[PDB]
Symmetry: C3
Subunit: 131 residues, 3 copies
C-alpha cells in the first residue's frame, strides 16, 4: 500500500481505471506560474508519498504536455521510497510561446515501479561474454 498526504484535498491525484499505470499529479501554487520559453519553474504538487521499499515513483509528463512543449527539466522524476517531501515537478518550456498553469490542473503521471536493490552488486575484473 502506497500512502499519500495531501497538502489540500484538491491536490488529490486523478485516479484512473484499475488498469491505469499512473495517477495524475496536479499543480499546486498560490500565484501565477508562467513558464516562459527557455525557462523552468519548480511546480509543487501538494502530494507527499510513502512509496514502499523496493519500489520508486517515476514522474513523467502527461501526453497532453507534448502539444504544450513542457518537459520535466530533469527528464523524469525519481521518487525514492524514503522521500517524504511533496513531489515537485520542475517544468521547462522547450517551446516558443508562454505556458500558463491553472492551479490543480493535471500535469504529470506518477507510476510506481519496482527496482533491483542497488546494494545487490559485485565488482569484477571480467564480465561474462555475450559477443
Amino acid at each position: 500500500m502506497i500512502k499519500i498526504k495531501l497538502t489540500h484535498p484538491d491536490c488529490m491525484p486523478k485516479i484512473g481505471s484499475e488498469d491505469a499505470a499512473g495517477m495524475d499529479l496536479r499543480a499546486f501554487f498560490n500565484d501565477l506560474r508562467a513558464i516562459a520559453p527557455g525557462k523552468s519553474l519548480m511546480i509543487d504538487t501538494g502530494v507527499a508519498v510513502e512509496i514502499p521499499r523496493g519500489w520508486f515513483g517515476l514522474v513523467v509528463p502527461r501526453s497532453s504536455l507534448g502539444k504544450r512543449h513542457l518537459m520535466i527539466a530533469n527528464t523524469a522524476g525519481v521518487i525514492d521510497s524514503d522521500y517524504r517531501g511533496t513531489i515537485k515537478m520542475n517544468l521547462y518550456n522547450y517551446g516558443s510561446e508562454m505556458q500558463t498553469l491553472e492551479n490543480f490542473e493535471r500535469l504529470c503521471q506518477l507510476v510506481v515501479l519496482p527496482h533491483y536493490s542497488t546494494h545487490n552488486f559485485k565488482i569484477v575484473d571480467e564480465l561474462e561474454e555475450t559477443i
Copy 2:
C-alpha cells in the same frame, strides 16, 4: 503474453535477442516524413497492444534518435493495459537540422514493465 494487432504486417516491431528490454516501434507514414527544427510530427506506429493487467508499456526513443536530436514531445509514452488504440510517437525535433524519416523506420522502443496498482493507496493526515 502480449497481444499485438498490426494495422499491416510491415508494422511489425523489430524484436532483438532474449535479453532485449524493448521492441522497436516503426513509423507508419503517409505524405509527411520530415520534421523541421522546432516542429513535431505525430507518427502512427500501426501497433496496437493488449498488455496484461499489472503491467504497462513505456515508450522511449531508440538511442539512435539521440544523434538526430528527436524526442517524444511528451518525453515518454505510458501505454496502459486497457489502451486499445495504436501506439503513437509524437516526435519533436529539438536540434538544428531537418530529419527525414523512411516509412517503417525504427524510431522508438516499447518496454513492458510492472507497475503498482494505482488503486492500492490510502490517504493519511501524516506519515512516517
Copy 3:
C-alpha cells in the same frame, strides 16, 4: 546480482541507502568538459554491467541536472541484460548558458527494473475490449 566492471576504481557508482531507486553514474574523462548551448557530448561512465536476465537498466538524469538544462540526447538510456560495453551518457545542453562537467561527477542514475520478455507476444487479428 548486478556484476560491475570498473575502468577505474573511482568510476564506482554512488550507492545510496536501501531506499535508493538507482545508483548514480559518474563522468569519466581527464579534464573538465564544457557543453555549449545546442551541443552534446558522449560521456563514458567507465562502468560496464552485467544485469541479470529478466531485468534492464534505465538511465535517467539526476534531478540536479534539471536546473542545468541537460538531458540525455536519446531521453533515457536502456541497458539490455546482454550489453557488455561501458554505459555512455550522451548529454545534450538544451538551455541557453554554458554548462561544465568535472571528472567522476555524478550525472545520471541507473535504475534496474524487470521487463516482460519481448519474445513473449502473439500477432493477433483483434484485441479484447
